[PDB]
Amino acid sequence: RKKISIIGAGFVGSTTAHWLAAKELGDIVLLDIVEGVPQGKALDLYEASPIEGFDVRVTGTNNYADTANSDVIVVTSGAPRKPGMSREDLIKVNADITRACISQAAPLSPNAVIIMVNNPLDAMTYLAAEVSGFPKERVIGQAGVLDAARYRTFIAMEAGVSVKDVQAMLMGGHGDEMVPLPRFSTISGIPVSEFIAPDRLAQIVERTRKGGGEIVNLLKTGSAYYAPAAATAQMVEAVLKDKKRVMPVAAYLTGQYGLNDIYFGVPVILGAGGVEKILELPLNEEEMALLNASAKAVRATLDTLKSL
Amino acid sequence: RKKISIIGAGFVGSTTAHWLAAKELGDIVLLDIVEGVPQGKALDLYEASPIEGFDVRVTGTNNYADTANSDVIVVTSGAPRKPGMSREDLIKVNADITRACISQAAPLSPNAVIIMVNNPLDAMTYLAAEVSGFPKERVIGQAGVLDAARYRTFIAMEAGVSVKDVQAMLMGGHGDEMVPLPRFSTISGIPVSEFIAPDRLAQIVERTRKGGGEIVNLLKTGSAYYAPAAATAQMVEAVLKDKKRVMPVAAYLTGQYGLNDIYFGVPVILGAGGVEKILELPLNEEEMALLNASAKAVRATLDTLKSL
Amino acid sequence: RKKISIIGAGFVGSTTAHWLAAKELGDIVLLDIVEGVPQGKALDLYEASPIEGFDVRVTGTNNYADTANSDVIVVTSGAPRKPGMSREDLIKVNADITRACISQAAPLSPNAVIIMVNNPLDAMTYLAAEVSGFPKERVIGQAGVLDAARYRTFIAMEAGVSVKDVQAMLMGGHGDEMVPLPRFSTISGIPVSEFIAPDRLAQIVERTRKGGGEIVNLLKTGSAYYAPAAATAQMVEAVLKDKKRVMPVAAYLTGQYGLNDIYFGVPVILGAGGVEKILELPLNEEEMALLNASAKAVRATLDTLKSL
Amino acid sequence: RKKISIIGAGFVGSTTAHWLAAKELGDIVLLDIVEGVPQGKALDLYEASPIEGFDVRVTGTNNYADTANSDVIVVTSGAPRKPGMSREDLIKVNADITRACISQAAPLSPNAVIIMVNNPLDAMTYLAAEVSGFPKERVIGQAGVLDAARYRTFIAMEAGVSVKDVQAMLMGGHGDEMVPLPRFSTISGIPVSEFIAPDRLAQIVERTRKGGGEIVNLLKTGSAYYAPAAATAQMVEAVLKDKKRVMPVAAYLTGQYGLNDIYFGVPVILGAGGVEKILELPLNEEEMALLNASAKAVRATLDTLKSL
C-alpha cells in the first residue's frame, strides 16, 4: 500500500487525514511533536472506519522513523496566524519548524513528493526544496487549489450554479498579491464574464484574495482547514494515482512567465512524478502586471527568508 | 422517496438504472413491453445491492400503472440503429413507440420531468412535449451531455490530462450536423486551443460528430449505452437534487439563437424545475453558420415527423 | 432539499457537518453561541465543495430562527470532558446547555427528529424528550453506533480482517457499564468467538467500554469527534433516507427488557419515523445481569438529572 | 497503476468493467474473440468517464498480448445457459473455452490472481488451476459472494431492513446443492432467526439456491450479470487493495471439512495473496450433511470434467 506521512497533526494535518482516509489511498501516518495528539486523532479516525466503511491504516506518532519510505510527505506543522496578522508574519517561526521537519523527514523518504502547506507557502516550499535537496519537481506547495476553490465557490454562489461545472485558474504567491484569472475561468466551458458583471466579479476577485483572512477573523482562534485540507488531499491523490490533474501549485520556476529561481503559483500537470509540466499561459498586459506584482511580493519574502 | 420511471428496459434503460441505483436517488421502476426482461434485470440489479452497499427499490413491470406519480420519466424504448444507418432512419418506428409510451406515461405523472432518449432525439423530444402536453421546460432530451462527454474524452486523451479538469460546451441536433464548440472548451479554465493544435482538434471535432456511429460499427448488433446512460443519469440527478447544472440538452426554443418552435441542443441550467433557463452564448459567425446548418437538419426531421 | 441543523459547532458538530456535506443529504445549518465560529467553519467547509465536488449549502449562524423547519436536529452543544472526568461529571453544565438549545430549537422544527449527542448521553436524551415534548420515537440519542464502532474496530484489528465485514450489537447506557455483546457480534455472519480467543475478546470488550476515555487521555484538551461525528451522520442519513438501519441508539423504553421510562441503548430499526421499532433480544442471564447493571447506572444519572 | 484483464466481454465481463471503472482500481483490458465487441464497449464506457468523473483506462482487444503483466485476470468468456439448463449442462463448451483462455493468458501474467466466473464455476476453477499451474491460492472462483448476495437481499426484503446490515455465509458448489447457512447469517450481529420465521426462512434458503434460474427464466435469452459483476468486482478489489475480506469463494481444499483435491465454496480471508486463509467452521451434523451432499454434486462435475 502507498504510504502518506502528514507532519503536523494540527487542524489542517488532521483534516487532511480525514479527507484522505475516505479515499482509501493508502496508509496514513500522522506525526506531531506533541505526545498524544496524533495518536488520539489517528485512533479516533480509525474507529470511524466501520461506520463509513473504509479500510485504512491510520496511525499517530512522535517518531520520525515511522515516516520512512513514504510516497508523499505533507507538511502542516507550521504555526497558524491570528486575526490582524499576515502570513509572512509567520516566516521566522515557521522557517525553523519547516527546516526541522524537512531535515528529519526528507532523508527517510528520498523518493517522496513533498507537499508543503506551512505559511508563508511560497517561501516555505522554497525552503523545503532547499533543505531536502530533492528534485525541484518533487517539492511543491499547496495554495492555488485552495485559492481557486474559494474563487470557484464565490462564482458558483454568485451565478447560482453547481460548483461542479465551475473551473478557474489562479496564479501567484499565496498572499494578498494573489492573482485570480477571470479570463481563465469558465462554467461548462463558458467564460464567467458571461455570468457575472465586472463590478460583482471584481468584488469576487477581492474576496478571493482575502478569503483566508475572512475565515481567520471569524474563527478568531485559528485559520481555515476544511478547504485547505481538501486541496492538499486532492494533490496527494493526483500524485498517488498519477492523475495528470491540471491545477495551480507553487512550483519552482526557471524562466516561465519571465520569473526565475522562485517558488510561485503556476498551473502545472500533477502526477506520479510530482510537477510533470509547468504550463505557460498567454497572459495579457493587465494579467502580467498583476502577476509581476505578486512575483515581487514573493521575492520579498524570499529575501526575508534568506536573511533568517 | 423520489420515484424514477424508465420506459424501455433495453441497453440504455437498464444501464441508466444501474448508474442511478448506485447514487441512491430514489425508487426506480423499469418498464418494458416485453414480459420478464424488466423484472429480470430489476431483480438482478437489486441483488447486487448488498455487495455494492446501496439501498434502492428497483422493480420491473409491464404495467404503466406502476409508473404513476413519478418525479422523472426516462424514455429509452426506441429501436436502436444498426451499422450504416442514420438516427433519422428510425423516425417512423420510434415515433410510434414514443407516442405510445408518452400517451400512457405522461397522464400518470403530470408533475414529472420527461427526459427523452429515443432517437432521433430532437424530433422525439418534440413529439413527447407534443403528446404529453407538458410545460415545454419539463420535457427535455438527452444528447448534448453525451456528445460533449465524447468530445471531452477525446480532448483529455489527446492532451494527456484527467477528464476531471475538462469541460466543453456543444450544441445542435443530436446528429452529424452536431456542433462542438472549441472556443467554449477549457481545461481548468484554459482554452483547449492552448493544448491541441487546429488539425488534431478538427479531427477530434469530427470524431465527436461521428462518435455514435463509431461505436455502432464496432458493436454491430447495437448502439452505445454506457456513456448515454451515464448522461441520462446525470440529468435525472440534476433534476431530483435540483443541482442547477450547466449543460447542453434538447430544449424548446422561442427565439434563442434566432431559432423558434424547435427542440434543439442548447446550454441550459437544469434543476428541479427542469429547464430553468436557456443560456444564449455570443456565438461568432463561423459557429453560427454551423449552428444554422444543424438547425436546418433538425427542422428537416420535424417536417418528416409532422408528415407521419 | 432536506434541512439539518447542528446545534453546537464545536469538534463534533463541525466534523458532523463535514461527513454530512460529503453525503449531499441536504442543507446544513451550523449554529453556536459564539459568534463567528459557526460562520467561519461553514464557509471554510463550503469553500471545499469545488475540490470535493459536492453541492451542499452549509451556513453558520447564531440565530435559532435559521434552524426553523429542520427535518433533523443534531445537538452537539454540550461541554466535553477532560482527562479524569466521567461523562456523568458533565451533567450539571450540559443539562443547562441542553435545555437552552432544545427549548429554542424544538418549537421551530415541530416535525423534526432530534438526535442528541451531548453527554451524559442517555440523561441528556431524556431531558430533550422532556423539554421538547416530541413523540418519544422522534427523540433519540447517538451512542450505540459509536460504541459498537470502536468495538468492531478492535475486532477487525485483532482478527486481521476488513472492518467492512464486522458487525456487532452493543447495548446499555453510554458509560462505563456499557454492554458490548460478543455473542451478538459476527464477521461475515460468523461468530466473533471463531476468530478471537476469550481472554483477548475480553480485553476488547473492556477496551470498548473505556474507548472514550482512551482518546480523552491522548488528546488531553478534548474528546473524540471523528467516530462520534461519523456515528451521528449515519443516524442522520438513516432518517433522511428512511434506510431502516438496524442499530443501537438510546431510545425510550416502555417495558422492553423489563425497563420502563428511561432512555437506554437498545437495538432499533431507524428510519424516517425515528425509532420505528425496538428489538427485544433473547439475552441470557449473564447478559441480562450486565444490562441491568447498566440500566442502574443510567437510572442513577436520571435521578441526578431530576435533581438539577 | 494496477492492471486487470477481463477475458470475455459479454454481459458479465462488460458489467464487471463498469463496476470496476467507477472504483478507479486501475487499468482495465476487455478481451474477446469477436472483434469490435470489446473495443466498442470499452470506448463507450471510456466516454462515460467525464460524466461520472473517474480516471480509468478501459481498452478493448482481441489480442491476448494486451493482457500481459496483469495483476488480476477475470474470466467471463463462458457461454451462458438458457431456460431449462443447469450450469453443469455448459461444461463441454465451457471447458474448451476456459482451457483456451487460460492457456493463453496465464503464461502472460505469471504473478496474477485468476478469478473464474465461467460456469459450472467450481469445475471451471479447477480446470483453470490445472491449465495455468499457478499456486492454488492465486486461482479462485467467484460464486459465494453472488449466492450470499441473493440470500442477503431476500433477507433484507423479508425483514424490512437495509441490506447494509445483513451478513450471511453461504458454502458449497455454485449449483442447486448450494448451502446457505441461516445459523451463520446475521443482521447487525443479531441472528437472522430473530427476524424471520423458520418456514419463511426456509423459502428464502430455497429461493437463494434457485436464484440464478429465477433470473434466467425472466430474461429468457441470457442469465444474470449485475450481481455477478458486482460480486466479481468486490473480489478484484479485495485482491488489488489487499482488503482481507472474509467471504465465500470457490477455493482449493486439501482436507478442510474433510474434503481434498477439489475447488469448493468455502469462507476465506481474501487479500493480495488470493486465498490467504481458509476458515474451517464448526458446522453441525445437519449442516455437514448439506455440505457433503454439495461436495458430491461438485465431485460429479469434476468427474465429468476429467472425462472431456
Ligand SMILES: NC(=O)c1ccc[n+]([C@@H]2O[C@H](COP(=O)([O-])OP(=O)(O)OC[C@H]3O[C@@H](n4cnc5c(N)ncnc54)[C@H](O)[C@@H]3O)[C@@H](O)[C@H]2O)c1
Ligand atoms: N498553504 C495553504 O493554503 C494553507 C492553508 C491553511 C493553513 N496553512 C498553514 O498551515 C500550518 C498549519 O495550520 P494549522 O491550522 O493546522 O495549525 P495547528 O497549530 O493546528 O497545527 C500545527 C501542528 O504542527 C505541530 N508541530 C509543531 N512543530 C512541529 C515539529 N517540529 N514537528 C512535527 N509537528 C510539529 C503542532 O504541535 C501542531 O499540532 C500553518 O503554518 C498555517 O498558516 C496553509
Ligand SMILES: NC(=O)c1ccc[n+]([C@@H]2O[C@H](COP(=O)([O-])OP(=O)(O)OC[C@H]3O[C@@H](n4cnc5c(N)ncnc54)[C@H](O)[C@@H]3O)[C@@H](O)[C@H]2O)c1
Ligand atoms: N439520445 C441519445 O443520446 C441516445 C444514446 C443511445 C441510444 N439512444 C436511442 O435510445 C433508444 C434505446 O436504445 P437501446 O440501445 O437501449 O435499445 P434496446 O432495443 O436495447 O431497448 C429498447 C427497449 O424498449 C422496449 N420497448 C419497445 N416498445 C416499447 C413500448 N411501447 N413500451 C415500453 N417499452 C418498449 C423494448 O422491448 C426494448 O427492451 C434507441 O432509439 C436509440 O437509438 C439515444
Ligand SMILES: NC(=O)c1ccc[n+]([C@@H]2O[C@H](COP(=O)([O-])OP(=O)(O)OC[C@H]3O[C@@H](n4cnc5c(N)ncnc54)[C@H](O)[C@@H]3O)[C@@H](O)[C@H]2O)c1
Ligand atoms: N457518543 C456520544 O454521544 C458523544 C461522542 C462525542 C462527544 N459527545 C459529547 O458532545 C458534546 C460536544 O463535544 P465537542 O467535543 O464537540 O465539544 P466542543 O466544546 O468542541 O463543542 C461544543 C460547542 O457547543 C457550543 N455551545 C455551547 N453552548 C451552546 C448553546 N447554548 N447553543 C449552541 N451552541 C452552544 C460551544 O460554543 C462549542 O462550539 C460534549 O458534551 C461531549 O461530551 C458525545
Ligand SMILES: NC(=O)c1ccc[n+]([C@@H]2O[C@H](COP(=O)([O-])OP(=O)(O)OC[C@H]3O[C@@H](n4cnc5c(N)ncnc54)[C@H](O)[C@@H]3O)[C@@H](O)[C@H]2O)c1
Ligand atoms: N456466479 C458465477 O460464477 C457466474 C455468474 C454469472 C454468469 N456466470 C457464467 O459466466 C459466463 C459469462 O456469462 P455472460 O452472460 O457474460 O455471457 P455472454 O455470452 O454475454 O459473454 C461471454 C463472452 O465470451 C466471449 N468469448 C467466447 N469465447 C471466448 C474466448 N475463447 N476468449 C475470449 N472471449 C470469448 C463471447 O464472444 C462473449 O462476448 C457464462 O458461462 C455464465 O454462465 C457465472
Ligand SMILES: O=C(O)/C=C\C(=O)O
Ligand atoms: O489564512 C490562513 O492563515 C490560512 C488559510 C489560507 O492560507 O488561505
Ligand SMILES: O=C(O)/C=C\C(=O)O
Ligand atoms: O448512435 C446511436 O444510435 C446511439 C448513441 C448516440 O446517439 O450517440
Ligand SMILES: O=C(O)/C=C\C(=O)O
Ligand atoms: O469520551 C468522551 O467524553 C466522548 C466520546 C464518547 O462519548 O465516547
Ligand SMILES: O=C(O)/C=C\C(=O)O
Ligand atoms: O444462473 C446462471 O446461469 C448464472 C448466474 C449464477 O451463476 O447465479
Ligand code: NA
Ligand atoms: Na475561455
